[PDB]
């Protein structure tokens, strides 16, 4: 929390019979690092 996050669009349609809703955004960046690169252990995260 308190982390800067770059968001984009995301197309998950929500469903009715199970009360799943449709968020419309996916995190693309955290704290200036690409979510992907972190996940690839390619780049590391400056934690402040």
């Amino acid at each position: 929390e308190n982390d800067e996050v770059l968001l984009a669009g995301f197309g998950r349609k929500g469903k009715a019979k199970g009360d799943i809703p449709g968020v419309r955004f996916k995190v693309v960046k955290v704290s200036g690092v690409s979510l992907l690169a972190l996940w690839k252990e390619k780049k590391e995260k400056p934690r402040s």
Binding site: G32, K43, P46, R47, S48
Partner: protein, 670 residues
């Protein structure tokens, strides 16, 4: 109700102009902390990442490009901390150069900064074991605004064509840890140097959460006043940054401890600590009074079977009517049918090898026990429990046990951490006598004998940190724990491991568990840290109310840095409700097979032992349930029923559980 809206050109333009005027005002207010004429203190720390590199030189460049030869010459003589006012941009910098022989001194230096400059070598590649760890650890504990700068670039070929190569490779190395930046600046050129100086002066430094929410003063002058023969008042002249200090709250000082305040004066009024004083005692005497209702004081000595009465059989009563038959020499059977009435390097090496072996053993075979024939299983597990579902049944936190630590009552039992944290931080913000940007004399009470270790504020950094409410009071804390990169080595859950959160460092024998959320808040006790995933480390240690990042390490004298960096993470929770059950698995081989009844072998060795564990469920790693029926032989063989059909390649197992208690922690110095 209310009519609708039809915003005109004018309305729009205005709402805009107002939004932006407000934005601008707020920005000016937030950029007034560095009015470089009277009220500013931009802390820049110089961190070279290469052995064969001089920090004094890096400063020399930055201030020679300010065209001030005097301020350079006056610093060579004797100093390491400087108060440099630049007139070009009108700014008050404070430069700090660390003792590059002490790792922890580097961390302490940077962790107070508003800016971290990184020196990079054009000649020497950064060390994998030292400088790299500087990068990562700084990064984990917290960094404000950082910069990547070079000095050694002229040491390579004289033609720029080759220098720019080194520069760019350094840029791509530096980008890896610090993607916020893409330009490693070259001080050799006047332009880049003038530009980095420019930034340090002008650019506003970002915020590091935990340090900014409790306030901090970097000390310029430290004097001492004798009051009593055995203790006096440390006086500290320094500018306050962050949230500020209150006279009542305690102050931490690194490698010295937590102390309480006596007086504070401002020179930009006088405030003295009164009756609302935070006290210098860990286990508050009110904590003893908070845990008064001891709920379960169960006596495991008054048990004929395993404690599992909630889901098991019924209290079987065995009224023993023993009479003695007097035929000389006679079995217990005949007697049962005569009187029947009806109405230092070697040590470490050997031990460490054994720990690796036990850990890999713990991966291949999790929590299994090996019972011997001579071993009375009952006694050996008499204190244990035998719950069916570990996350459903009713463990409790308030249970009294001789194994429980004496202090357990005297602990700070915060109900809710998320809310208490916010409330107390708002209190501290509102009740702040001394705000950021104030110059302060700080009069702290202090035991005389420690004055010997205190150095000079100009050759060594002297930082003064603020504490919040009850932060001196111990509690049951849960940390998030993740292994450091390239660290395969084993780490058991009882060995001393130093932990740095905030600026405070406490040696800790932490209990490792998996933070998997449970409806009854009961988590498996993991003897050794999991090699892949984030885990949880629980122990009795002073509270932290800003969720500081934590660094886990074990001081190793041999390495350059006198520290082995084990793992990292965060201060998660001030919670006692977390209980930890040491599991204990009993293993047995399914001997013989009948179409519904399976005879099981080598899990006990007495029939009475089998009686004792009747109710306890049997699970097979093939993923199948079952229960015991009755004892076959006088050797502990036991018949059993199950869910599916099991072969001789399966393992029948029992799960028994015990309460595991957090352990007391002591501060760590030097």
């Amino acid at each position: 109700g209310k009519p609708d809206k039809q915003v005109s050109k004018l309305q729009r333009k205005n709402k805009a102009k107002q939004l932006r005027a407000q934005r601008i005002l707020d920005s000016i207010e937030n950029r007034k902390l560095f009015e470089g004429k009277n009220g500013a203190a931009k802390i820049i720390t110089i961190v070279p990442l290469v052995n064969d590199l001089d920090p004094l030189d890096i400063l020399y460049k930055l201030l020679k490009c300010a065209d001030d030869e005097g301020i350079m010459v006056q610093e060579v003589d004797s100093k390491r901390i400087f108060n440099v006012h630049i007139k070009k941009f009108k700014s008050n910098l404070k430069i700090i150069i660390p003792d590059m022989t002490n790792f922890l001194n580097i961390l302490d230096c940077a962790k107070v900064a508003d800016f971290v400059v990184f020196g990079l070598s054009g000649v020497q590649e950064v060390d994998e074991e030292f400088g790299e760890q500087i990068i990562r650890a700084l990064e984990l504990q917290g960094i404000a605004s950082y910069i990547g700068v070079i000095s050694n670039l002229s040491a390579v070929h004289e033609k720029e064509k080759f220098q720019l190569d080194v520069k760019q490779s350094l840029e791509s190395y530096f980008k890896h840890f610090f993607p916020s930046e893409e330009r490693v600046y070259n001080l050799e050129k006047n332009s880049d140097a003038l530009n980095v100086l420019r930034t340090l002066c002008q650019r506003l430094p970002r915020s590091i959460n935990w340090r900014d929410n409790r306030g901090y003063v970097v000390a310029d002058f430290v004097d001492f006043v004798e009051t009593s023969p055995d203790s006096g008042d440390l006086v500290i002249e320094g500018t306050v940054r962050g949230i500020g200090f209150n006279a009542n709250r305690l102050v931490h000082i690194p490698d010295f401890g937590d102390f309480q305040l006596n007086k504070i004066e401002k020179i930009s009024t006088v405030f003295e600590s009164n009756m609302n004083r935070d006290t210098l005692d860990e286990y508050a005497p009110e904590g003893t009074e908070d845990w008064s209702d001891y709920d379960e004081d169960f006596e495991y000595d008054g048990l004929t079977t395993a404690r599992y009465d909630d889901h098991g059989f019924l209290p079987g009563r065995e009224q023993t009517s023993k009479k003695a038959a007097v035929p000389k020499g006679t079995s217990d059977y005949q007697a049962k049918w005569y009187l029947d009435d009806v109405i230092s390097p070697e040590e470490e090496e050997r031990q460490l090898r054994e720990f690796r072996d036990m850990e890999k053993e713990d991966r291949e075979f999790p929590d299994e026990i090996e019972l011997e024939p001579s071993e009375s299983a009952i006694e050996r597990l008499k204190r244990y429990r035998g719950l069916k579902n570990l996350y459903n049944c009713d463990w409790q936190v308030d249970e009294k046990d001789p194994s429980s630590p004496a202090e357990w009552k005297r602990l700070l039992r915060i109900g809710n951490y998320k809310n208490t944290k916010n409330r107390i931080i708002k209190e501290t913000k509102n009740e702040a006598q001394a705000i950021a940007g104030d110059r302060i004399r700080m009069f702290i009470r202090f035991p005389k004998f420690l004055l010997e270790k205190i150095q000079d504020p100009k050759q060594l950094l002297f930082a003064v940190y603020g504490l919040l409410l009850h932060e001196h009071k111990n509690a049951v804390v849960n940390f998030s724990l993740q292994r450091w990169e390239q660290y395969d080595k084993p780490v058991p859950s009882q060995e001393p491991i130093v932990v740095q959160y905030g600026v405070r460092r406490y040696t800790i024998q932490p209990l490792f568990s998996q933070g998997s959320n449970s409806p009854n808040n009961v988590h498996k006790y993991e003897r050794f840290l999991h090699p892949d995933t984030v885990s949880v480390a629980t122990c009795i240690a002073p509270v932290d109310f800003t969720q500081s990042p934590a660094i886990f390490f074990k001081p190793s004298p041999t390495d350059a840095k006198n520290i082995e960096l084990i793992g990292h993470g965060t201060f998660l929770n001030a919670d006692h409700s977390r209980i930890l059950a040491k599991r204990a698995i009993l293993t047995g081989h399914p001997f013989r097979f009948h179409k519904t009844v399976v005879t099981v072998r080598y899990m006990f060795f007495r029939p009475e032992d089998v009686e004792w564990f009747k109710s306890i469920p049997l699970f097979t790693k093939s993923g199948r349930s079952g229960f015991i029926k009755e004892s076959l032989g006088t050797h502990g063989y036991f018949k059993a029923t199950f869910d599916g059909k099991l072969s001789a390649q399966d393992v029948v197992a029992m799960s028994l559980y015990k309460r595991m208690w957090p352990m007391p922690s002591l501060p760590w110095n030097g």
